[PDB]
Amino acid sequence: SSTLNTRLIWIDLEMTGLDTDNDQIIEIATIITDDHLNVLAEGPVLAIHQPDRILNAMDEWNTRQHGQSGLIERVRRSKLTARDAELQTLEFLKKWVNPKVSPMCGNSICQDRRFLHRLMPELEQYFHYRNLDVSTVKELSKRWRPEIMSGLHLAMDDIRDSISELKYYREYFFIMN
Amino acid sequence: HMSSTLNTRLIWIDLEMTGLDTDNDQIIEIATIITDDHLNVLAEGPVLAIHQPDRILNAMDEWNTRQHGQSGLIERVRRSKLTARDAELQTLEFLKKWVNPKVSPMCGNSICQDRRFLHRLMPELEQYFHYRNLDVSTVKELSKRWRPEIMSGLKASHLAMDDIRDSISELKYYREYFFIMN
């Protein structure tokens, strides 16, 4: 049975672009699991408001992606600042995991951590300094077990896919004895 | 398995810094190693100390002062005439003989930290990597929780080149005990 010290925080962000120095966060989502990847609770899925000048200055790829998903319209309608979403996320996390206990879990986590550091530093500091990036395992699996790869940007569904991807590796790639 | 090429190799890297602040601290040491996709070491790269003025060295906290004093890195830094640009260029020169640009993920331990310093202080080198990371410490986090009984088998120094060697040895250890290779 899991405790406040034996749980994992999973997180995904959507941004206005790939520039970790300049672009904004427009969506955040979190999921809590135990050390054995059982989902315990899903956190708030929050769209962060951005002015139209920022949305209209996105490149074509991001305009297509975030428009088609409906994120852009949710961002327009949202009244939440980055700070509002940060506080709501923290309020949720504190009920499930103690501070500095969980590594930051998900796919391509370094990118997420860099955006969090600049725009949501208090949230960033709630994580342990370690990362648990499923894409590291994928890099190894592509090279050492290419035959299992055939078996494999909406924030909450993105996290579920990441958790599910790691369970796939646990079954076929890791010795669990 | 096929023989390795410029498109099927891995760049392992480690940096030593004046501290943990990715916004304000400096790089004082860099090393690289080239492996194939199956962790055969093909070539070890240049070990370079980057010069820093005394004010910056004096401002280091206790842990860094203790470690880098004992290891001989601080004195190497003082005597060094290399800038971060010099060290960046010598490394790039080594890498281009072994690996094509944007082919290899950034490999090592605590790689996100290294990438962030590289982005600020050696962006051309940072851009030579593929955007993905291969962080052995992710595997360690999994091993701590799923195979705690094997952690004691992990085996010294605090220098960049020794750090890379250790991360390669660590991953080889996981390959033998934690991964299904068949």
Ligand SMILES: [Ca+2]
């Ligand atoms: Ca992510």
Ligand SMILES: [Ca+2]
């Ligand atoms: Ca994302």
Ligand SMILES: [Ca+2]
């Ligand atoms: Ca290091």
Ligand SMILES: [Ca+2]
């Ligand atoms: Ca070897």
Ligand SMILES: [Ca+2]
């Ligand atoms: Ca490192």
